[PDB]
Amino acid sequence: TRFEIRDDFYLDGKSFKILSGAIHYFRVPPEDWYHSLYNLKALGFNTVETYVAWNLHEPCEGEFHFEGDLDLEKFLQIAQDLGLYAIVRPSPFICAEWEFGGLPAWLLTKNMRIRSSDPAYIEAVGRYYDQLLPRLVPRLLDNGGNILMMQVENEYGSYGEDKAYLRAIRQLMEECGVTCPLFTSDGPWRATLKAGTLIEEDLFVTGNFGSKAPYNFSQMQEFFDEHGKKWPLMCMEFWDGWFNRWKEPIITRDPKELADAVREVLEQGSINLYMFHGGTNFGFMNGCSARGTLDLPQVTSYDYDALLDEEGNPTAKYLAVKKMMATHFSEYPQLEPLYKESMELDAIPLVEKVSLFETLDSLSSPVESLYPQKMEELGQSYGYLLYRTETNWDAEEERLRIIDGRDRAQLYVDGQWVKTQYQTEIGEDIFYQGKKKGLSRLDILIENMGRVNYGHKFLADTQRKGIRTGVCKDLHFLLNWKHYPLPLDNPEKIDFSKGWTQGQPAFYAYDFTVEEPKDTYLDLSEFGKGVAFVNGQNLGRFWNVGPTLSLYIPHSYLKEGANRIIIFETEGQYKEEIHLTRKPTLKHI
Amino acid sequence: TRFEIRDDFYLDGKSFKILSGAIHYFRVPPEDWYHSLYNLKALGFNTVETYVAWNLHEPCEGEFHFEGDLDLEKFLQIAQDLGLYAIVRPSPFICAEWEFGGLPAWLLTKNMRIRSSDPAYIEAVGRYYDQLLPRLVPRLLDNGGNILMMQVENEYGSYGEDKAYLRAIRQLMEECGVTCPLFTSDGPWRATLKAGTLIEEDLFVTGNFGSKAPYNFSQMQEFFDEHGKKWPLMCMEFWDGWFNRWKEPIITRDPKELADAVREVLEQGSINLYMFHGGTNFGFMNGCSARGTLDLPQVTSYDYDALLDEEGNPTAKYLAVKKMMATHFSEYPQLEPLYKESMELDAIPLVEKVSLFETLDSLSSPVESLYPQKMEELGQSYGYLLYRTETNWDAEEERLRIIDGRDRAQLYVDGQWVKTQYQTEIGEDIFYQGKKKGLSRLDILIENMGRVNYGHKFLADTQRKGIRTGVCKDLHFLLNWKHYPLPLDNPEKIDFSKGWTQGQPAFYAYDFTVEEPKDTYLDLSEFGKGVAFVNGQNLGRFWNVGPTLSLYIPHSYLKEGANRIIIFETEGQYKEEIHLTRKPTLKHIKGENL
Ligand SMILES: OC[C@H]1O[C@@H](O)[C@H](O)[C@@H](O)[C@H]1O
């Protein structure tokens, strides 16, 4: 065996220190995989680590995708070609500040206990592995690839103590032909280590933490000694920055201090920098944090204050680590990192616009039923959902209430905006004075702002989006609903020839020519809320609450010559022109 | 046909004004049905009205009960023998300040949309109707009984607009032989009347309100006119008082004002006083109000400030209405009302006591599973549910959290109380310094304090009681649970020979002898919280927050000779003896009115 875990890591009979950086293939465009992997190599590090996102690879049950932006095999091959080893964490649940922690949303339509030894759930994970694992097994080092070892579950000690669950996953991997060493990662204290591991069954244990390697490793060492294990020390996630959430201030970490904290790990064991290069949560795939009953959604940018910025350029922190390495670990060869240049344009004018209500039928085909349905039971995972019904008014003024809706609701009557309610505001009284004669159109646009990816709210009832109970008018729930799923995966269907109306959700088109594609940032600091596309590719979410006020556009999303940017904006605040900038626009908080 | 709804109510061809009073057979001991019905007749009224509680008659799916306390047929026979007509409202949902609006809790384990045209739900209502309605059909006036008409659903306009649902309920009733007139009742304004009725299919419409009969009846009249109906006006629930909730002050209504308000109703049409006699929510059958996301549980006493008090004696309000009737409707013959006498017994000493933990095994056979289960999925509808696990402490102090538990939780570690959390407190961090070595016993006692009986929270996730997600220790959910369902319908299984410990839920027994059984009130003002039994009969809940601090004990619950009260108290607060009083003990809360 080329890679062994004993009293130490051994690669080809020789003692080996793992120097790893996290780069999620699904967060960096494929055209920059080489760039980012090169820059990890140039740091003097020897290994790349990545999660695998189940929700991306099986977006609908039984429908699998492993090409293009999802070509994990190619990501791994470029790594090997650059002479990098790999650690893969293929857990059904990856946390990762990622939608539903990586779990497919269609699971919410299933009768199963997600993330447990429930066989209904295990079976699903099995079918997923039946597709994923055969692609990774040939890429094990022993088999001629570069994969050193793989993770079982992910910080399971911060969720449960179901050992049968951990054993089931390990078993599934083994019988699919995974013969490399397997391991768990957890918080480095007793409670999480006990609950999250199979140490008594010889399953390798790693710790996750972002400082104080000496103390944390000692807790790990004490745990190993307790079980008679003579094992190397590895930090499977050394949090070197952090993620950002809407409305919350961007907080960076001192490059030098991070540099020193990393040194402390390397002196005692191995490391995987989380993140090395963080990249972006394109489209609707951002995750969400929880505090008690409250959800706190995470931003589109996964810059993370990582070594490489969102775009993939080295930072003070990268340079500070390069120097810490050249000073304290000079035996590890270094190189010069690659840089990309960003481009800059001013005032690309508005060509065309259209209200959602006007282009609604080319975008979406409605589902009708007596009672309102939830997003996932309609077959939708991500995006927006429009509930439509008709009702006449039975009094000069009437009260409307959305009962058990999530995450954000905008209510219109005959096209006129009445109210917007976010999270815990949903359910509050809405008062309306409607036409005395005839049916009036009640439209409620719902947005899924990202399913919680961790902890006690992981399987809360609020994880199913849309209206779960109903909409009350006076004292009775309204019936006869038309549902328009709006995943907005079909931006080519937006009909800009139809009408536009102030104070409504709408699409705004901006055209421009590009001579040579270069990275750049869409300035959206004067738009309210929504998503943006470039040549039909969903860039992710914007929101003027900050801290981020821009969307990053990779050079590879642009095309020589004519380009089209499209902005879906829901608040009614837009601009007749857009700026593309060199540097992202930030809101001070 | 003897009874018809035309441009008026006609009985045997003659104009007829219905003078009805609500008495719920299930809220009054059967030995006192005659008493209550007689007093209704003595008022000069001609009709009694009652809901039927599905959750009482079908306590477990497929298991039906119509005897004893639930002998609705005997209640109707007593009314008839006393010369009273009857209105029955056999809606699957009755609201009624009653647990889960009368719906069986086991419906929560089914894949169905409760209270809708969902055929799964309709099929359940039908199977229940298959047992209930054949019992009432022989009792329709046309068949020699006293039932004039029956209600379809209940204020459905305060819940939905599913016309297929209403039609389904109508169809089921007809299919079972119900040929008397049918009707709906709703709030008397446009939204509720449109949503709640089948007026366009000639289903009779009635209104519920507590005042301003002239104004409320004109709203009903406009609706009728709009649909070309010349119908009599009837108030199917004239709210004459109101219910109480724990921690909330008792507010009464002036006897004269209420008499006046009733006079206004009768001047234009027919009435059904809600309640004529309210009685008692025995055992765990109380309902629950909601405000936004918050639950507001209703109290054991359904006195309601009704015309007869809980005990069933005429009140100042009864006398006010009687004087009004004597003056303004003297053509209705009256009688002298009946009064029951109450008793008092001092300092009945505590004889025996046993902590719940010590008598667990005779009360309840454990259900063991890896993940924690909710109350209904274990097969339990009412009462308490103990969750038990074992765990070792991985730090000097660890955090515990109960995730998604309702309604009230008490947590013990190795028999020692750590914390009690009610409703929204559940889920707050609990910090504990655990044993130095080995497994500790983690006990969590959950109480179902009553499912919401109305409105937007009627089918909230919180309606399923117990722990719906789990119990977190540090950052992980705990596994390996033993569940002990504690419906407490088996007080004879309490083993007072076992041990007792301070600061724990426990049972306490007080013995006494009675020569002549009379009504009386158990003073529980110095007991924390729990339930009380007399001769094995669950009187209902007590809680020292008030406003009620007693439990009414009907004479029929007592025996000539030796009697035993058992008190289950959860807070650790009890006294070495109890007093029975002639009148209830109340707690003075700010805002109260008498
Ligand atoms: O960036 C925060 C990190 O937290 C870790 O505990 C988790 O395993 C990662 O997936 C990521 O969510």
Ligand SMILES: OC[C@H]1O[C@@H](O)[C@H](O)[C@@H](O)[C@H]1O
């Ligand atoms: O006492 C309040 C009443 O409210 C009515 O609307 C309901 O129909 C009754 O069952 C009862 O709940």
